[PDB]
Each structure stands twice: as C-alpha cells, then as structure tokens.
Ligand binder design. Structure first.
Ligand code: CL
Ligand code: CL
Ligand code: CL
Length: 126
C-alpha cells in the first residue's frame, strides 16, 4: 500500500507568489518530519525554466524542519491568467546507507515513495 505523505507541509496546499513579477519572486515551503526516522525528499515544479528550487533534495532528521526556497523568474504578468503550475514533493524513508542518493531513489520500490502536490497562485498586492 502506497503510504500517505509523512511530511507536514507549510503551506500545505497553495504556494502564493506576490507581485510585481518584474523581479525574482521567492516563496518558502517548510517541510517538517513528524516521524522518528530520517526522510529523504525531492522537490520539483512542472515548469523548471520558470522556477528554481533550493535545496531541491536532502534528508530531514526526525522532528526537524527544513525551509525550501522556490524562486520564480521575472515575467510579464496578466491578471486574467491563473497559474497552472504544480509543485511536487517526493519523499521516502531513508535507508541505513544514504551516501549514494542516486542509487537510493532508483532502488526505491513504488509503494515506498510518498508524493504531495501543491498548486501555484499568482497575486498582486491589494
Ligand atoms: Cl495551503
Ligand atoms: Cl517513525
Ligand atoms: Cl544553477
């Protein structure tokens, strides 16, 4: 059975980016690990040329939290266009050996992976 996402995300669903978008706009995403085990994570967007994410991967200690910076590139914003961009978080419980994360993610069984999706929202100041 594919488990639910073990991490607690703040914000849990909607990532908001406040304009104006003539500059780089950054929004934070906190990943909290409420379990007693290390959790490896990977964070991606559906538009890699417009977003950067730092860090895009790592391991979270039990009970700890990491802040992920999502950077939106400047663009010409039209208020009558909603953002169709999604943000994927993929997590897996860390195996004992994590010195080779490429091998860890590749050996991962399908049900060992946990996934969360966040929607993006563009907004201007009031
Ligand atoms: Cl939310
Ligand atoms: Cl646990
Ligand atoms: Cl880079």
């Amino acid at each position: 059975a594919k488990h639910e996402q073990i991490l607690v995300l703040d914000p849990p669903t909607d990532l908001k980016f406040k304009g104006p978008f003539t500059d780089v706009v950054t929004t934070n995403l906190k990943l909290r690990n409420p379990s007693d085990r290390k959790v490896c994570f990977k964070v991606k967007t559906t538009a890699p040329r417009r977003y950067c994410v730092r860090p895009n991967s790592g391991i979270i200690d039990p009970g700890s939290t990491v802040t992920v910076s999502v950077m939106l590139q400047p663009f010409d914003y039209d208020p009558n266009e909603k953002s169709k961009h999604k943000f994927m978080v993929q997590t897996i419980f860390a195996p004992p050996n994590t010195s080779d994360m490429e091998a860890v993610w590749k050996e991962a069984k399908p049900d060992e992976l946990m996934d969360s999706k966040l929607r993006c929202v563009f907004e201007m100041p009031n």
